[model samples]
Each structure stands twice: as C-alpha cells, then as structure tokens.
Target: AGAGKAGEGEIPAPLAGTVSKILVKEGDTVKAGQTVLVLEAMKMETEINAPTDGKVEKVLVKERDAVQGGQGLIKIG
Candidate 1:
C-alpha cells in the first residue's frame, strides 16, 4: 500500500474524484490557495488549489485518472 506518497509541499486530492483537468503546468508558479487543477466527483467539479507560494514541480495524476482523498496530486517546490 506504498502507492500513495506526498512530498514536502505536495497537494493531495480533496476527495475521491476523477481528474477532470490540470489547470497548471509543472513550471507554473502560483500563490497560496490558487486553483491548480479540477476534479470531478459524484457529478460535481471541484477545484484543487495550491498549498503555498511555489512552482509546480510535478504532477502526479493525469486527466481522467481516478484519485482518492489524501492521495498526492501535485508537488510544489
């Protein structure tokens, strides 16, 4: 069950959802609480926001990928 892991400033999925869209790229820099991605769960779309002021270092999930709450989705560095 080691499939789920989070790095220093990683953003985890807020809830179990299908990754509807990735709004930012790896090199994109954003402030705290900014929308970084979008998720579709139970017929509702949710915004995935930035954890803090930093640049996106990695994207752990792709569009259409299924993710559960607390699973790492984005890495900020």
Candidate 2:
C-alpha cells in the first residue's frame, strides 16, 4: 500500500539507463509479467515488467529519457 492507492507506488529504474521503449501506455490494462518498458544500460537491454495486474496510472519517464537507480519510472494502480 502506498501513495496513489492501497497498493500503488512508484516503479523505480534499477540503474542508469536510456529508456529504449515503453510498451504499456498510460491507462492501459496490465498483467503480471507484462513488459512495461525497456532500458538500455551498459549496452545491455533490460525489460521492465509489471509487478501486478493493474491500470498503468502514470508513466513518469519517457522514451530516450535517461534514468538512474531509484528514479520513479512509472506508477501503477
């Protein structure tokens, strides 16, 4: 349970990376194991997956945006 709702919170980037792409748009329905975005870090591409089934409440970062560890990438509800 966090800010937006009983179980909603920010999904932070795990490391510094360029956001390669975003799969789920804001307000889109998402499920566990769904790829929300991709991050290219240290020449390796990483898929950021949804932690639960919920609507994509917000996307705080955008494609090509550089993000660091603990930076809020998106929020789900």
Candidate 3:
C-alpha cells in the first residue's frame, strides 16, 4: 500500500472507511486538529484531523479510496 516509512509525519485513519474527500494537498500548511480529509464509514461521515502542525509532505489516499482502520493517509513534515 506504499504506506511509507514508519514514524514521523504519518496520519493514519482512525476507523475503516472510504476517503470521501481530501482537504489539503502536498506542501499545504496545516494546523493540529485541522480537518485534512473526510471519511465515510457505516454511512456516516467523519473528519480526519491533523495530529500536529506541519506542511503536507504527501497525500497517500484519494477520494473514494477504501482505507483500513489505522491505515496511513497523509504525511506531514
């Protein structure tokens, strides 16, 4: 799944869901608790929040992509 190197900058899914939308792009600056994406699971939508302030290094999943619980989503640094 090309989940990238372990530790640092990685944002993982909190629950198994489909990526409904991505709110940030590579190089985008984001704050901790900012919504980075939307996830849909069990017909409910959930906001994926940033864990820390950082520039987005990469977006690992696209809209409609199925992700597992705890799957990597974005990389920030």
Candidate 4:
C-alpha cells in the first residue's frame, strides 16, 4: 500500500512463514527477480523478490517473525 507507481511493489511472501532472513534493508533499490527476503513455511523456504524496480521503503517484519498471507512484509516505492 505504499505510494509508488501503481502495481510497482517488490517482493512479498508467497505463503505464511516465519521470516528467515531479510536480504535487503531500507533505502536499497532493487531490480525485478532479485531475492530480498526469505520466509520459512511448512518446512519449505520461500523467497520474496522484487516485483518491479523500486526503492525499498519499509520492511514490516523481522527475522523469526511469523507472517500471514496478504500481510505486508515489505513495501517499495
């Protein structure tokens, strides 16, 4: 829900998981397909990547934090 280009948001968890690592931090510009963070779910690891080229605005969760579907894990603008 960040105020960037419409539909230009990076990288969200595909499913519910505890955040394992945050590869990118605030203010980092990222390209599409770049892995920014990883989530551990149901014994599987999911990589959240950039959906579009944008600057990272905020990271909503931290390592070991459990996140749910549709939850805002990070925002790019």
Which residues of candidate 3, in runs, are more than 4 Å off? 1-6
Name the runs in model 1 displaced over 4 angstroms: 1-3
In order, candidate lDDTs are 0.85, 0.80, 0.84, 0.76
lDDT of 1 at 41: 92
- Return the number of clashes found in candidate 3: 0
lDDT of 1 by residue, 1-77 (tens): 47675645678777899999998898989888999989999989988888888998898889989988888888888
- lDDT (tens digit, per residue) of candidate 4 on 9-43: 53455677888989988988888789888888897
Please name the candidate that would achieve the greatest TM-score relative to the true structure.
1
lDDT against true structure, model 2: 0.80
User: Tens-digit lDDT track for model 3 on 1-77?
Assistant: 56533355688777788988899999789999999999898889999889989988989889879988777788889
Candidate 3's displacement at residue 17, Å, is 0.8
Task: Say what the RMSD of model 4 is.
Answer: 4.3
Residue-level lDDT of model 2, residues 1-77, one tens digit each, is 33322223767667788899999888798887888999999989999987777878888879879887777778888
lDDT of 3 at 56: 88
Between candidates 3 and 4, the one scoring higher on lDDT is 3
- Write down the worst ten-residue block by lDDT for model 4: 1-10
Clashing pairs in 4: none
